[PDB]
Amino acid sequence: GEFQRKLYKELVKNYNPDVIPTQRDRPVTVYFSLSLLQIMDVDEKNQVVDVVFWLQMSWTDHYLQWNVSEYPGVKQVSVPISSLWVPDLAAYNAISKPEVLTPQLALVNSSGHVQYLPSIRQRFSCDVSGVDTESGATCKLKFGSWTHHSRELDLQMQEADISGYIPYSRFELVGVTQKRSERFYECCKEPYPDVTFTVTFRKKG
Amino acid sequence: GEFQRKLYKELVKNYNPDVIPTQRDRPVTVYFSLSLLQIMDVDEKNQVVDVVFWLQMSWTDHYLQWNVSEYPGVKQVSVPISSLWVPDLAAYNAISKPEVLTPQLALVNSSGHVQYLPSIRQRFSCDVSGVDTESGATCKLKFGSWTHHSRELDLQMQEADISGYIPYSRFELVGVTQKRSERFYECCKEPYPDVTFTVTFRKKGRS
């Protein structure tokens, strides 16, 4: 679209994706949620889980807003994530780099709401010893900004989803939990939030 | 080519590959087809299919058209996909990133008709438990735009081809189905069209 074209030239003009879009004394609040789609495998020897997650991440980038009157038809845009600031979310218990399965694009509202919803396959460190028991194995997968404290990036949880879980596969879900936390670290003087996704699973039969 | 050199400079001038080439209240209709070339392997433990396919994809980019009078000989061009807008097609049941086996180039017509025909090797999540049975295993491989709804990107099926299927290999094809749908998500108004490629296969030696 010619109205869409005219906007991308502006949404680029003075945009630096390395800059966290904080506004005078206010953190960027980032909404976060993980959905376990499939437990691919477990390594009982090496103590690891091979898992496929759907991530729901949303925030506001004030540098990404536009007047819908200036660009009529343009309600939303699909922007490549490389073109924009994305939260520096770390998987604290990941033992492999993330494999992003879905197109690396984000949707952007006229008010600057960024929605990045990737499917990630990753391997995590976990005590899988009790996978063959009724109690099952429990993985506490922790995620959070690696470099931004609470006053810069406010991590918040959003409504989760266990409808996406693959019905076939050796593993059945005993329980799933998501909890947001905040702690002070001896290092920093400033606090840091995190979201912990907790899974309890077991081998079927 | 000489006019070809002059055209590539212009076909770049004001082109943004991140912009969907929709024209005033009309979606971009993308034609899509998938041809199963070979089922590489199955993981009965992990419930996965390793598959090779030929993707037939095409659309009209109204920003890519040119006057053949301005560029005589130039009927078509081989453009790298990275230089142009391509549909953001997601493999909904993929459990590995796609491995593109062919050159990453697209053929473009004087009227903006782009044809991207890659060979992809990818691993998908599938219930392969019945692979050793006469009924066989069935994989419902779903594909569609990740960010564009039906009124921005109109996914359409084109006539598919099962002549490309490798005659050797452990697996024989019981049946192949192609269906286009429009799914509504709780998230949003406006539906999301998808093409589901359904395969029924079985081990040749299952006796």
Added chain:
Amino acid sequence: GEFQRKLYKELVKNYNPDVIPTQRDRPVTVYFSLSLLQIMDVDEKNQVVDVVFWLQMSWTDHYLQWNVSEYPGVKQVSVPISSLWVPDLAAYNAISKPEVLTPQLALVNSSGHVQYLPSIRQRFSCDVSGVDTESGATCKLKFGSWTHHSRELDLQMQEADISGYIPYSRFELVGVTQKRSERFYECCKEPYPDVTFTVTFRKKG
């Protein structure tokens, strides 16, 4: 050289590697030949060959020619392949991306005749069932331009031999064939030339 440095500045000035260097109603004729250096492995289950090839591709780019009088010493130069137009040759039966083992450089004449001679390791789909037989297994490895027809890119064979073949290794060569063909597709009024490298091999003893 101080002419070589100036030559590279000019050989870049108005050069687009995305443009096929066809000149007025004439296709670019590309000379091609494969030499099987080693059959690494066979997967009898998955029906695949892991092979190491030496490719000899050579063509003439008219935009790359220069006056030797303008650049005295400069007879030839080593240009990175990424800097120049290379034929879009596809391995039709490849089931893995090519692993290029040699430096990614091509040699270029004062008349613009380019020579690209890489060693590639690639995995191909092949009926390897008869590898343990006296008749042996036969692989018909097809190669050709993915996007250019006969009137744009004229694929031509160069006679290759089998002197490069590794003498050790489980596999002995029963026969090697190379044939150039021209195929028509329902799509296109103009045909697509290809070179098929055919191997017949068997496990030793």
Added chain:
Amino acid sequence: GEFQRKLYKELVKNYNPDVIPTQRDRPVTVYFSLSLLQIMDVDEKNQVVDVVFWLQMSWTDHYLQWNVSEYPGVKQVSVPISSLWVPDLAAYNAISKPEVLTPQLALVNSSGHVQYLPSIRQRFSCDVSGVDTESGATCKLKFGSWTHHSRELDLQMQEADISGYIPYSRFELVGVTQKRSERFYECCKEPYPDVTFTVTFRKKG
């Protein structure tokens, strides 16, 4: 911040990441600590350890300092490591390239103090023969600047915490040591500082 863009624009237009930020006859002192998070696996045949480390690297880069008057709110910034000079630390006994698990960003103070804290998964050459013994296997993992001598880059150790060690897993820690040294090479006559991380571990039971 509005000044964050100002900051990133100038600390891009004038900063050369290739330049070691030494200031006149004074080396850059780099603080270094390694924390063993998990021993993933051991290869008794090939004599290798697959390990997950948390690295703590800090130094002062004088080219990255600013007064707060220059960038009002701006106290710190998350800069991509590719934008900065980072110590050229080599893992002398690594037999695989490092897999960096965390976002590749570093924190910079207004007084030029850089903090790079990556989680790395890497495979190292080690004599793992005694892993099944009470004495256990000992890995002497050596790290240091590959190209900078003592008078350019002053490697210094910091206090390492073994609090991060994964409680589950086949391997228990008998002992962990860190020693900084300065070696002489026949090449140079200026010494090369290094930190050797020594682990003694054994299979549980």
Added chain:
Amino acid sequence: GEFQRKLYKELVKNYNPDVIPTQRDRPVTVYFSLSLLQIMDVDEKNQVVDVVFWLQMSWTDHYLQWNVSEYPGVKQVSVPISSLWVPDLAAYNAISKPEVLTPQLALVNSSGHVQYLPSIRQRFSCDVSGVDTESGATCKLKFGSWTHHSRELDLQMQEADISGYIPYSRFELVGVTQKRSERFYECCKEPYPDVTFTVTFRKKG
């Protein structure tokens, strides 16, 4: 370094890394040596060696020299290899791409002497059948410029070090040889020199 920053600006000014730094009809002499650090594994089926080498490559790039009077403190600089011309050395018997383990930097003197000393892990084609014998298996690993002949790049060998060989590991060294040769090819008027590293090893008792 204030002068260092001033030096990197000039060392960039008109530098093209694609250009071999030959001076008016004189070849660039490159010093080369290889040091076997460890034989990782052998594949008796596929006929391959997995090896870790330390490479010592040195050459003089006349475009890289500077007056030490113009830049006081600056005796040497660590430049990323990507920023400068490096010899296009091919591993003629490599069946995998090289895995470079060490930082990809080279040291450069005030007189243009470049020293690139990487640790490479690579897999080579080799007749490993006799690895379990007293005679042992012999690998003739050939290396040389892929595109430059004797009059452009003069390959020379330097001091061979076997002190770096890992004492643990299944394999003991029977013998190591390095020889430089000047091969003539039917293709070309000018000879192509090469260095062949020959190893004889065997499985320990």
